[PDB]
Design a protein around this ligand. Sequence first.
Ligand SMILES: [Mg+2]
Ligand SMILES: [Mg+2]
Ligand SMILES: [Mg+2]
Ligand SMILES: [Mg+2]
Ligand SMILES: [Mg+2]
Ligand SMILES: [Mg+2]
Ligand SMILES: [Mg+2]
Ligand SMILES: [Mg+2]
Ligand SMILES: [Mg+2]
Ligand SMILES: [Mg+2]
Ligand SMILES: [Mg+2]
Ligand SMILES: [Mg+2]
Ligand SMILES: [Mg+2]
Ligand SMILES: [Mg+2]
Ligand SMILES: [Mg+2]
Ligand SMILES: [Mg+2]
Ligand SMILES: [Mg+2]
Ligand SMILES: [Mg+2]
Ligand SMILES: [Mg+2]
Ligand SMILES: [Mg+2]
Ligand SMILES: [Mg+2]
Ligand SMILES: [Mg+2]
Ligand SMILES: [Mg+2]
Ligand SMILES: [Mg+2]
Lengths: 79, 205, 61, 86, 81
Amino acid sequence: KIRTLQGRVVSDKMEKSIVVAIERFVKHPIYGKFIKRTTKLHVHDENNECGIGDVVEIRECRPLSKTKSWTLVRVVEKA
Amino acid sequence: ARYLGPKLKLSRREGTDLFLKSGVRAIDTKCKIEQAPGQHGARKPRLSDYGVQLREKQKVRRIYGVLERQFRNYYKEAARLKGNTGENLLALLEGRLDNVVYRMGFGATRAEARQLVSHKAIMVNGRVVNIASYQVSPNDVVSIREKAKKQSRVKAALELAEQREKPTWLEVDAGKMEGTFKRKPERSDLSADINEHLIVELYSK
Amino acid sequence: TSYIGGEGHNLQEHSVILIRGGRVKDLPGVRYHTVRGALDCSGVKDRKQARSKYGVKRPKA
Amino acid sequence: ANIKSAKKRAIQSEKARKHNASRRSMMRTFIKKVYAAIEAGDKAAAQKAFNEMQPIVDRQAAKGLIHKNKAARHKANLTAQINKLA
Amino acid sequence: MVTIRLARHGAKKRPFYQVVVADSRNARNGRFIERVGFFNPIASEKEEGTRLDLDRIAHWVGQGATISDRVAALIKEVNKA
RNA sequence: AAUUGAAGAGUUUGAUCAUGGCUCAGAUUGAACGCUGGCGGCAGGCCUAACACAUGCAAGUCGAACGGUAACAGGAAGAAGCUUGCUUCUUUGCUGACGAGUGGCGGACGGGUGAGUAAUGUCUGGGAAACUGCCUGAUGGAGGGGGAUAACUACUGGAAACGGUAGCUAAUACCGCAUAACGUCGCAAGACCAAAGAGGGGGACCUUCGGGCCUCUUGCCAUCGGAUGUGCCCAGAUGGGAUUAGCUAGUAGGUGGGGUAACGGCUCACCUAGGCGACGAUCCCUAGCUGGUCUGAGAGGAUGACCAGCCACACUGGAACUGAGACACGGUCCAGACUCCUACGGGAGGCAGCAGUGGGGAAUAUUGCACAAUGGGCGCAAGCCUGAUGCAGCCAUGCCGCGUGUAUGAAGAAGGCCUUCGGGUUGUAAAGUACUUUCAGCGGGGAGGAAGGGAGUAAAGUUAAUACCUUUGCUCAUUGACGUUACCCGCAGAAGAAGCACCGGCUAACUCCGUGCCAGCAGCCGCGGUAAUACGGAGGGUGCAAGCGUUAAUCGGAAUUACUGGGCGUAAAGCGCACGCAGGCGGUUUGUUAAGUCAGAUGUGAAAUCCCCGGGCUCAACCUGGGAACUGCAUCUGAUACUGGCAA
Ligand SMILES: [Mg+2]
Ligand SMILES: [Mg+2]
Ligand SMILES: [Mg+2]
Ligand SMILES: [Mg+2]
Ligand SMILES: [Mg+2]
Ligand SMILES: [Mg+2]
Ligand SMILES: [Mg+2]
Ligand SMILES: [Mg+2]
Ligand SMILES: [Mg+2]
Ligand SMILES: [Mg+2]
Ligand SMILES: [Mg+2]
Ligand SMILES: [Mg+2]
Ligand SMILES: [Mg+2]
Ligand SMILES: [Mg+2]
Ligand SMILES: [Mg+2]
Ligand SMILES: [Mg+2]
Ligand SMILES: [Mg+2]
Ligand SMILES: [Mg+2]
Ligand SMILES: [Mg+2]
Ligand SMILES: [Mg+2]
Ligand SMILES: [Mg+2]
Ligand SMILES: [Mg+2]
Ligand SMILES: [Mg+2]
Ligand SMILES: [Mg+2]
């Protein structure tokens, strides 16, 4: 199986692209609490179908634009 | 690097003999051991806990002729070694080549044994060692070189040693002038007036 | 502003001195001493104890 | 310079720069001829210019003036131009 | 070329070379790829004064690594034994 | 086995509790300064001006690519002698070789510095759209020509630097032509793309005696694959400030063209109006990053000197050229500031390479020796170069070790100080006696760092071929700067070798005299006004010791930023009170998921350093072998109680 991630779309204004917010669950180094941290990845989107607020599953690939190295694989759900 | 001062002042300070003289005669007729040295000797000294710890450290150091930096290295090594730190420190102190020579009786005092060691009159396992702080390991055969077997120092030292207690963990000869260092001496075997947890606490301070 | 220790100095104006830290308590704001015996701040005349603190060479035995 | 090897290398670098500039200008001239053939619209002229060009860029790639990747880039780009031209 | 050579460590007057497979451009005591053994020139007798990892050295030679002169002598002597 | 480790004290008050700061006791340093200073080992030594540089050296090599002969050796002839050829002398590149030149490789490494750089860098993990000289394996091919141009010759410009014109010559210099493929392009048909020879020996046959001809070594050129190196992308982490809140116009995306070795707004045109930011964007101030180092019980905190990995820079600001690799420390070009030469037209240079000079500063070293070793460049090789590196020089800068004597020795000697004047202390201390000689001084002997390489042979292969050559052994004579090395023996004699701080409490160690809130001490409490254990001197004592203190700096103590590990009624501290988005947290049962979580495995987490078990320097410092550790991260396989999601 190939490495991948799964996140939530926050913007689809880009043409043939989406912005995906991926939340990770990191234990704080000092205080030991498990804090939410969210990374925003510009995800390539051929066809352009994903909407704002859907759970999409993405994979790293070669660079595609200035800030787009990730791309879709499948849409987990529609929202 | 060596305390080249009067010796009995140290014994007078600590209130007890440190064997800094040969032992041909009792030290009472050589110094007022009951009285601390100096103008204010009869003064009754109320010592603090730090006073107690400091004097204990000094006493043992003066006995073996060790200076503070070297003794601190001994303490660090004893703490590092497994087991009881105080007994490890005492064992490391006993392992010193000058002390081994003293115990085996080739020196009337530890200063005499130290000069014998430093003048290449002592061999270990056959090789000449002139390091007064060489660590003697188990089973070593501390010897006297042939060109130094004829010194009246060694004789007088042997007949002075014979009238004291014989260290169990050693085997000495007066003819061949060798000694097997059977084992490491134990805190139980050594003199029980030395209270080394005072040194331990002091260096933990 | 620098304190000058010792028993009497010989520092006139324009003297080239070497100063070190360590304030003087009873003096307002004086936060430095002058190292005796350094460049011009010559040693105290006729000391016998703590000569190294006042730049006095060992008197002959 | 101030080292004999540096001086000799400077002379050699200048001479090689002149030679390589000559060859590079020739290669660019032929590629530009091809490109003008496409952008003027003609197809047979474009293909003929491409056929004249291709040995030049391949020979220069072989000699090291450029890289075989660069030669392939020019070749593929111009061939796609010809075939889309019609 | 990747070379198998001696990086000198130890102290003054007492060398102690480590046989390392490294790029020939790096510094002598600098970046290496693998440590394949050691050599003590003042090795006292009874102690293993020279140890080479001949399987790894052969691996590197097969990969094309060149062998320094002193390392070649050490390999000859060790495989002679 | 890879650890076993955690101290408090003073000070607010008439006194006591508590809160709370301030201060001291410890460890350490790239240290400086004061006093003092015997030896050795190992290490370290411009932290400031990335300020300016006199001077010498720090990158060359190859005649086995080439023309050639400037010099040397000088063999023949010829010079031409009585030396009958050891006369300078003339010719011959004839030979060994080799200045200068073409050409190949190196100069992009090694070495220095931390100015810039707060994330276009670094660390960790993961990738794809990639080049990679020398090295290596396999597959192949190495045919045939052409025109040059240095060198040199002649003329000639310039003060010089530096050229210019005409003529000639060689190549493994350069360019065609032939030949292509599993190579490029193309769907395919098909089209297209390279090369360089040199050296050693040899029969027989050719022989213009060049040489052909035959084998051998090596080099050349496609192409594919390995290894190393490098380029590129993503994620997390990587300082302070919010009294810096909005920033962005190729800006974000798309398409198409161009460009790179390679993906890419890398660049351009057009079309969309986006992109980032309260999980801190933008701006501002400092700053190289890491392994690690210091401290700490630990968590942490501070810092990243030496050593090693990465990056960046090379007088300042820019550019590209050659090159496999640079936008290049000792290369080019341009501009600029300095400095120097000039014939006034013009030129030259760049120590943050080693050493060194000036200056700055509290402060940091020799204008040394050698390529013997390790490594590097070139070379088939010898060998040449190497201020890398190995050593040595100066410095107590640090760590470690050793010595300055050992004992016996009361006449408790004198002297000194205190005295209650009776004595006590200095003090077995000295003197005296006997003994030893480490280290330093002198003399004698003497490891190891030395492997290789040179000559010849034996074998072995090769090949007609004992010939070369390539291995492998074999005997020979050698290769060490350090270096009068480490070390060992002998000498003569205690002989050449102890100081610094402190003594009111904290804090180990106490009395006289001088001074009289003065002189002064001081880290805090404080001390000093005529009996000062606190100032200064003396005796005595304490601590440490070739060091000892002061200062600077960090952590500790400080639970005094409290995650481990604090508080908020009155000591500082609950918003005046509510509502409430984001955010934090979430009652109870079943099912499912496996994110968190846990377990196991795999890959990495460089080496060194720390730690454990050992080994070697006479021990230690130091150097090493092996382990452990590197708390991490990425997958994979399980558990799924608890949290999370999902559905009831
Ligand atoms: Mg010492
Ligand atoms: Mg120039
Ligand atoms: Mg500097
Ligand atoms: Mg350069
Ligand atoms: Mg060529
Ligand atoms: Mg800076
Ligand atoms: Mg703590
Ligand atoms: Mg400069
Ligand atoms: Mg190029
Ligand atoms: Mg460089
Ligand atoms: Mg330079
Ligand atoms: Mg310099
Ligand atoms: Mg100055
Ligand atoms: Mg030798
Ligand atoms: Mg006290
Ligand atoms: Mg008085
Ligand atoms: Mg704390
Ligand atoms: Mg509190
Ligand atoms: Mg109040
Ligand atoms: Mg209050
Ligand atoms: Mg309230
Ligand atoms: Mg719940
Ligand atoms: Mg490690
Ligand atoms: Mg649940």
